[PDB]
């Protein structure tokens, strides 16, 4: 070809008969979302999922389908990828079952058992995620702690791909030049995941809180930033400030974020002070469970 590459993912197309809904999960601007059970016809496997269902129109139709090219077309393991769609009435994206939820709220329910190990982890898979996504030439468009998912408390993956594209709106996780301009690079999404970062490290406290979002941008460009958290040594702060500069490219690449979040997570207590970091423990890995597999583990040819 002349340009992109072909892109070859496979869209699956699932039957109604083929999963059962268990429960609602949630209900917002995102959607709604069920926990059910996906039972390939042929296939002694059940498959936990989340199934994504619109808040029917052809506006709703054309961007929801959007959502999941880009999801189909995505397979790394720090993304939630499509595991197919339903062609019911109402158009239905079956999805991985993250069952701990959105990490912004893992971090505000578990603020007193989450160490820094787990903090600066999370931080490197979000960094690979990320440049994964900056790999197949995609900008997320809408990284924050809210759109990565926790599929165990070791485990997170990012989700969220209704805003995202080739190289009301969030104004306090966007860059400078997105607010005023309309730009977006990956170096946008850097700004972000600096945001992102600084949410985790407050154990999910709102950016910018009581100012609003109009103020933004010209606070911003006055050049005040969103401040220190009380468990943030100077190395770690420093990043996000190198995520946050007017100048794009002098920010730090998702690369370079890995490899310095991989180097302070070897040695977690230098870089996050936590009260009593050391005791701290999460959980680590009614329904006929025998059959049961992630769909990490089912595989398609
Ligand atoms: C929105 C909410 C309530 O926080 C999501 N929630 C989930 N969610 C998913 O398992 C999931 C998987 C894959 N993708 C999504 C997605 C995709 C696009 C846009 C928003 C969410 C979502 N699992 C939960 C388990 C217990 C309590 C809450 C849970």
Redesign the pocket.
């Known amino acids: 070809s002349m340009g992109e590459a072909p892109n070859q993912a496979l869209l699956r197309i699932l039957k109604e008969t083929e999963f059962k809904k268990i429960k609602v999960?949630?209900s917002?601007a995102?959607?709604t979302?069920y926990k059910g059970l996906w039972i390939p016809e042929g296939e002694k496997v059940k498959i936990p999922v989340?199934i994504?269902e619109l808040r029917t129109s052809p506006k709703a139709n054309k961007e929801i389908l959007d959502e999941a090219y880009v999801m189909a077309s995505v397979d790394n393991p720090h993304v939630?990828r499509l595991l197919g769609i339903c062609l019911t009435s109402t158009v239905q994206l079956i999805?991985?079952?993250?069952?701990?939820?959105?990490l912004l709220?893992y971090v505000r329910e578990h603020k007193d058992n989450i160490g820094s190990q787990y903090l600066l982890n999370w931080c490197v898979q979000i960094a690979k995620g990320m440049n994964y996504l900056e790999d197949r030439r995609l900008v997320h468009r809408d990284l924050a702690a809210r759109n990565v998912?926790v599929k165990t408390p070791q485990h997170v993956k990012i989700?969220?791909f209704?805003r995202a594209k080739l190289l009301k709106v969030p104004i306090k996780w966007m860059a400078l030049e997105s607010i005023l301009h309309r730009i977006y690079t990956h170096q946008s999404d850097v700004w972000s995941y600096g945001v992102t970062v600084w949410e985790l490290m407050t154990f999910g406290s709102k950016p910018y809180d009581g100012i609003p979002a109009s103020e933004i941008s010209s606070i911003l460009e006055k050049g005040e930033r969103l401040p220190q958290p009380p468990i943030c040594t100077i190395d770690v702060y420093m990043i996000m400030v190198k995520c946050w500069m007017i100048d794009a490219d002098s920010r730090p690449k998702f690369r370079e974020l890995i490899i310095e979040f991989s180097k302070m997570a070897r040695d977690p207590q230098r870089y996050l002070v936590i009260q009593g970091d050391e005791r701290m423990h999460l959980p680590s890995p009614e329904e006929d469970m025998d059959d049961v597999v992630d769909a990490d583990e089912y595989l398609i040819p």
């Open positions: 999960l949630g917002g995102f959607g979302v989340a994504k939630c999805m991985q079952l993250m069952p701990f939820g959105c709220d998912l989700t969220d209704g």
